Design a protein around this ligand. Structure first.
Ligand code: A1BMZ
Lengths: 421, 82, 421
């Protein structure tokens, strides 16, 4: 029929590295990390002792709830929702898109997911209902556990009357939010989509849950705990944050004189169908969804020059992704660069895929590759360029085209193909 | 003597003026919660919970759905006395 | 073949009407309901006193977990996950699609969402962590609260390695699952999608949460509590269940000699962007969503003959939907039929949109319209044909086209346009 092009015109970041597009990128390229030690009596008795938190306060690059939401709102809604509203405000300001006309409002949709509901609000409400009874239960209880409350709030505040699409896919939420938004715009359903992910579920109970599943690094030292592709990797580090991207049809962006970061070319999805937690040891699943994204984009493996890997510092996970890259890209695997930013931000769960879409986008825009931190050495199976320790300039003899991967529990895989103009 | 009505009315207003979403200078005794003050149902539920604490009894949901203005809260509150 | 045709070839139902395609449909057409009185010590404190449960047992049309999942799996998986696996098994059996070749496995994806996590598992684990310590948390805890675990298990069990997509949109999950699956197949990403929704969150804590939000009937009579479009409608009744549809590209289905129920023509989405609680009283959002679905399908309003309305027996909700129908269809509003099946099944939350897609699909296959129950009395504002009390035949000589609507909290609207072949 037709195919319209889709570009990214706004980025909003609330991360363990801080808040704001320029600032977060500068820290990322500079080799900074937000991974810190857990402190508190409620976290004793848990094997894990590190996490990555959004820095809060009033200095520049700190998250201040009050700059984004009113005092009434702060009590009414969850921490993830507030971060998503924050990231969205920043993203739309970065985009310069303020729909006033009805036609512009119906052209603009939202796709902001949440990976997981915060277990603490459930437990506190539950105990309050047992102790004190029905009449003491907050009416905001159910709103605070619904995944699409973020999208709802953004939609109301910015008058976004186009496609509304919350999704919750645990660790792939952010990727699906961006990919689906791309598809909606490409198909003609909207001209603009505000897309991303949020997660803030660092709590004794959730860390307990992940620790018990053998998922988390037990290393006590925040400087070393998260080490993608490294020999001593022993589990991921839980992080929190939100990232929002404004996607937009190409001609719409150009005509309104927007600053364009990059173009979204493709989206792919696959299932492992091996096992629940275990990734496909050969990376069959990862290979298929990367290939699906390349087919969607009409691009050959040899044109890819960077990959933001999902690698979360797990033994089997990092090895699977690495295998898939080598099988898909063949000889050209040695010509490309691969980096995981999880050493810097930790694993942002639902937001992981949206933040890494942002980073892949900025990589294209600045032709600069963020480091994989803590990668002081490497085993023979890991013999590619993982951009160890320091940033590298991205140099290629044609267009700058990257992939960003997101793999989730249950063997759901997603890949986005992002390119410089 | 248990209660005045000028006095249970001072408490309904006291409580409403404490509630962050109500703007004190729009809050009259007959202002509708949703039409004038711009609240919603969930907010109104919070208002009757605050009333439940202030007068120390339980208002059933059936009866709480009715109370759409401060005046109407006073009369329901007043049902216990004369 | 950039935009193919998409058909439905399989339906799997686990509802409060019972289990199995023929059986559930017959009982629906016959005016049966699964709404019953709550029978628990722990339900007395809450002003709701009715719900709709899936009947359990080994008689015909009753749900028997054992026929779908092993005795070990029952312990490690939530109630909604088990229902989704059951509905999926039934749906694929009903389709005759059991992919064994690699080509067929990669061409088959899953899109099964869960609208709400079961609060009870969170609260019991939380209390166990507080009073018994870290070593008493199950390692199956986190898997049991993830929204994509249903899709995960289906994918593994039936070897489905195409697009994997769990969506959690609360009350609109099932609609998004089917619409997105349609888009994926039309776009070329998959030949087959196993799509639907599940929810089983009837518990003291969740009923308490919904009661507090003024959402639920307080009516004590299970026979009368849920009455869409009726003057004394006072809230929805919570149900549980799962529904799965096998969607399939037209040519693929024909070549394998599949029994085709109906064709999916279109999908639309919008957001109200007004207030998070109430629908827009004029239903401008519902109108735009329905119109977007009609545009996607390349059909004018005058070709629609049936609408499965979202009406959940809410005062403002049912009135808004009714207004939207009248403004969109104009004079043709009096020529069509509108029915809400929620009096029969209750509100199945995440599954609501998938079960109603199933019902609209079967309404296509036969030309039989399920009744709106309990509609003995009607206000002047509601002056359309709501198929009151008794089912109606609808033998148009022209092609039978239905819409099914799903409206969610946050003001998110979804519409699917489904057609007899
Ligand atoms: C599904 C998620 C569950 C609800 C969470 C509380 C949402 C769903 O079913 N979508 C909406 C369809 N129904 C409506 O349009 C709701 C209409 N609203 C009502 O009448 C509600 O009962 C109130 C929130 C009480 C209305 O609020 P106040 O009277 O303003």
């Amino acid at each position: 029929r037709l195919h319209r092009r889709v570009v990214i015109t706004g980025i909003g970041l609330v991360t363990p590295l801080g808040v704001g597009t320029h600032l977060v990128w500068d820290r990322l390229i500079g080799g900074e990390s937000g991974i810190v030690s857990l402190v508190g009596e409620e976290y004793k008795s848990i094997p894990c002792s590190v996490a990555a938190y959004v820095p809060r306060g009033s200095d520049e690059g700190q998250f201040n709830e009050q700059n984004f939401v009113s005092k009434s709102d702060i009590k009414s809604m969850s921490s993830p929702t507030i971060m998503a509203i924050g990231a969205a405000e920043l993203a739309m300001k970065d985009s310069g898109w303020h729909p006033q006309s009805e036609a512009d409002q119906v052209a603009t949709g939202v796709a902001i997911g949440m990976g997981m509901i915060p277990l603490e609000v459930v437990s506190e409400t539950a105990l309050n209902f047992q102790t004190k009874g029905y009449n003491k239960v907050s009416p905001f209880f159910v709103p605070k556990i619904l995944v699409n409350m973020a999208a709802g709030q953004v939609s109301i505040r910015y008058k976004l009357k186009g496609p509304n699409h919350a999704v919750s896919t645990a660790c792939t939420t952010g990727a699906h939010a961006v990919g689906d938004s791309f598809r909606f715009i490409a198909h003609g359903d909207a001209d603009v989509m505000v897309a991303g992910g949020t997660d803030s579920c660092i709590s004794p109970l959730s860390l307990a849950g992940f620790s018990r599943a053998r998922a988390l690094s037990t290393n006590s030292d925040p400087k070393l705990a998260c080490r993608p592709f490294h020999p001593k990797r022993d589990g991921f580090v839980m992080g929190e944050g939100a990232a929002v991207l404004v996607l937009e049809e190409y001609e719409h962006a150009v005509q309104r004189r927007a600053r364009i970061y990059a173009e979204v070319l493709g989206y792919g999805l696959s299932g492992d169908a091996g096992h629940i937690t275990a990734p496909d040891p050969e990376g069959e699943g990862a290979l298929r969804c990367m290939a699906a994204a390349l087919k969607d984009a009409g691009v050959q493996p040899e044109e890819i020059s960077y990959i933001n890997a999902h690698a979360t510092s797990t033994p089997l996970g990092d090895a699977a992704e690495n295998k898939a890259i080598k099988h898909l890209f063949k000889d050209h695997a040695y010509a490309l660069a691969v980096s995981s930013t999880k050493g810097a931000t930790g694993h942002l769960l639902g937001a992981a895929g949206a933040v890494e879409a942002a980073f892949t986008t900025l990589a294209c825009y600045y032709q600069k590759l963020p480091p994989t931190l803590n990668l002081d050495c490497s085993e023979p199976e890991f013999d590619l360029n993982y951009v160890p320790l320091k940033a590298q300039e991205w140099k290629t003899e044609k267009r700058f085209i990257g992939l960003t991967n997101s793999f989730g529990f249950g063997g759901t895989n997603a890949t986005l193909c992002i390119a410089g103009l | 003597p248990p209660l005045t009505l000028e006095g249970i009315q001072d408490r309904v207003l006291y409580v409403l003026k404490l509630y962050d979403k109500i703007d004190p200078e729009k809050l009259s005794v007959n202002s509708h919660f949703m039409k004038d003050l711009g609240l919603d149902s969930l907010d109104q539920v919070e208002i009757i919970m605050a009333m439940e604490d202030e007068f120390g009894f339980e208002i059933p949901d059936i009866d709480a759905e009715k109370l759409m203005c401060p005046q109407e809260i006073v009369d329901y509150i007043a049902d216990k006395k004369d």
